[PDB]
């Protein structure tokens, strides 16, 4: 499904990303916008055979199992199909892990190119929360 920006902001804040690893809520909302255009079914194939899944484009090499990624680690311990759900619980809980490796949100390349350093607080203005 395609999330609306404020509804995604509310579910992300409820699931604990506001200020997770010091990154304000607007960062995660902006990330979803540029990684998948807020579409929970988005998929993106990589040259290393991995695929990026869901609203936060979680990579199949290190985070979830898709059975077709060659040297996969399934740190999140889940099938990638579970990252394609309308329910973002599993993607947010895996995204938390992704952000805690010592490098912040830098693995989300579209975040890095489109959101980082920008006025990401704008992505949540006009939202209940």
């Amino acid at each position, epitope marked *: 499904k395609v999330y609306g920006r404020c509804e995604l902001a509310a579910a992300m804040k409820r699931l604990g990303l506001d200020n997770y690893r010091g990154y304000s809520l607007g960062n995660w909302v902006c990330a979803a916008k540029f990684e998948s255009n807020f579409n929970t079914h988005a998929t993106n194939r990589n040259t290393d055979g991995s695929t990026d899944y869901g609203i936060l484009q979680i990579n199949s090499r*290190w985070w979830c199992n898709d059975g077709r990624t060659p040297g996969s*680690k399934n*740190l999140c311990n889940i099938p990638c199909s579970a990252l394609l759900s309308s329910d973002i619980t599993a993607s947010v809980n895996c995204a938390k892990k992704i952000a*805690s*490796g*010592g*490098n*912040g949100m*830098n*693995a989300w390349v579209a975040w890095r190119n489109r959101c980082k350093g920008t006025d990401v607080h704008a992505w949540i203005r006009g939202c209940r929360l």
Partner: single-chain antibody
Amino acid sequence: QVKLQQSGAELVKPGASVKLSCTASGFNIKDTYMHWVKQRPEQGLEWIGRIDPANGNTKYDPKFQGKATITADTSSNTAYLQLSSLTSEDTAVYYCARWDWYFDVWGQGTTVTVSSDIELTQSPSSMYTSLGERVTITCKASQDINSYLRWFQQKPGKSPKTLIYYATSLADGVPSRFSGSGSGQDYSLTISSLESDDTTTYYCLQHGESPYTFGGGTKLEI
């Protein structure tokens, strides 16, 4: 060819200042956090701080704030470490590093010679093992959150290598023989048949809450 070239062994008098550098190649530092680590002559690892070079924001272990300052210059791809009022306790090897799931890389280190809070407990401090024995080292904390713990292996004279990520996942290229376990506060590293390449010092690092902290280490001897 991914790398961090550390610039300069130095000898200084008590009270002097030194500024070290760490230039990277293969990746832009603006795209990362750059961490600095201290290691005294027969002692353990200590996290000093990190810098986010894209915006210059830094985070320190409060004990180093005022003595060590991290700085970064993105056009030169270089991160720096400035140390002030140097004393006997500052004689150490200082590494820069990029920590990222399955992408850890460290500089070769740089020796500085001065010449005139989560607790990680590592057991055993030192041990003698045999040629095909089963070894289990442990690491106990004060609630590491779920498994934000790295296992590093350091050989005499080399930068530490990462063996385990997220407590139980093997690094790329690490032999089958190694394995990690636990969640919560209690973690372990097991080597089934100790191979001869395994003689070294093992350290656990918690990156679950900031200031990142290291266990005291375990020297395995064959």
